[PDB]
């Protein structure tokens, strides 16, 4: 461990334009391994990682039929929510859910979660105690009371502590060590003009995975906590990620600045500077 089994669910209505679009996307350790997309003639849960092909026809059938059951329950929820919120029947709305379990190296549940959003805003969430609900607004109180009465939290705890955990284990026997995949960043500094006697030094990190990384600039040993410009980390499109951080520095003082790159994949952080060609 640790390991995680996560599902991201989306349900989007489109009145007059077809049935709601429904999607279940599953991740083992933040890597997509299954997906159900309702937007098809004969929609089926499909393996999204080749290791998942190990699972037999009985798995996909069961998962597919469960997905279609979920889909139709969400069809209903979408109508329920129009009522709760006094909304027109003509507009598009979305329900999202995040459901899953994070499991420690000892195989025990670290954290289980089950949270909903309607039109991009918190709706209701199972609390960390796996026993109570947080309702975000007046409509969510209705759901909350209904779920408290039916003992929905207890059903969820049982799934989170058991089923979720047991499935994650089974998936891992088929595709683990894969999730441990690590690609270290390669870095370089580029040099760019500014008006007057200033220049820009841009420290790039490329080809890394996972996306978590930190870039810093130091003047003579102290991180420049101010005026450092950066971009949000971004996918290269090949499974790896990019980032850069830049600082404006006085012309002629380029060698006084140092870029540091911290990433789980590296033996130790990278340290580099503007290296002007001969």
């Amino acid at each position: 461990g640790p390991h995680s089994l996560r599902y991201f669910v989306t349900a989007v209505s489109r009145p007059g334009l077809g049935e709601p679009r429904y999607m279940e996307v599953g991740y083992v350790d933040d890597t997509e391994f299954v997906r159900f997309d309702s937007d098809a003639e004969n929609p089926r849960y499909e393996p999204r990682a080749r290791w998942m092909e190990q699972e037999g026809p009985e798995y996909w059938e069961r998962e597919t039929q469960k997905a279609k059951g979920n889909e139709q329950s969400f069809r209903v929820d979408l109508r329920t929510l129009l009522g709760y919120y006094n909304q027109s029947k003509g507009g598009s709305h979305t329900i999202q859910v995040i459901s899953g379990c994070e499991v420690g190296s000892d195989g025990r549940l670290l954290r289980g979660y089950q949270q909903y959003a309607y039109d991009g805003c918190d709706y209701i969430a199972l609390n960390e105690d796996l026993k109570t609900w947080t309702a975000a607004d007046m409509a969510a109180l209705i759901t909350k009371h209904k779920w408290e009465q039916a003992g929905e939290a207890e059903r969820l705890r049982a799934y989170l502590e058991g089923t979720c955990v047991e499935w994650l284990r089974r998936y891992l026997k088929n595709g683990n060590a894969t999730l441990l995949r690590t690609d270290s960043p390669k870095a370089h500094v580029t040099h760019h003009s500014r008006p007057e006697d200033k220049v820009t030094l841009r420290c790039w990190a490329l080809g890394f995975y996972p996306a978590d990384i930190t870039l810093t600039w130091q003047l003579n040993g102290e991180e420049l906590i101010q005026d450092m410009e950066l971009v949000e980390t971004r996918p290269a499109g090949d499974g790896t990620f990019q980032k850069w951080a830049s600082v404006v520095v006085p012309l002629g003082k380029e060698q006084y600045y140092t870029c540091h790159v911290y990433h789980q994949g590296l033996p130790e952080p990278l340290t580099l500077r503007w290296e002007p060609p001969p």
């Binding site: 989306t10 996307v25 979305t94 971004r234 290269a236 499109g237 990019q242």
Partner: protein
């Protein structure tokens, strides 16, 4: 409630004039999930643009990656244009090989 898309346009690899590369348009932080993304070369829509599956974030906002093959030259201009209901008009963002 509507969330306005953030947009980055950037090459998969460091650009080199005359060298085949991939131009990305990374669009995030939008809601609702319906969105229309174009990429443009010298002002004209690039016909063959591919799209990743759409996903969503911890804050519920959606993101997606659009991309197309391209071979940068010193003078060709590239952009990504995004139409989304959170914005009165389509937002255009130019590729800057230094960024």
């Amino acid at each position: 409630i509507q969330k306005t898309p953030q947009i980055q346009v950037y090459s998969r690899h460091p650009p080199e004039n005359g060298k085949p590369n991939i131009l990305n348009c990374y669009v995030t932080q939008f809601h609702p999930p319906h969105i229309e993304i174009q990429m443009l070369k010298n002002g004209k829509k690039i016909p063959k643009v591919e799209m990743s599956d759409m996903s969503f974030s911890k804050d519920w906002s959606f993101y997606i990656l659009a991309h197309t093959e391209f071979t940068p030259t010193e003078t060709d201009t590239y952009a990504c244009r995004v139409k989304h209901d959170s914005m009165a008009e389509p937002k255009t963002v130019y590729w800057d090989r230094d960024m």
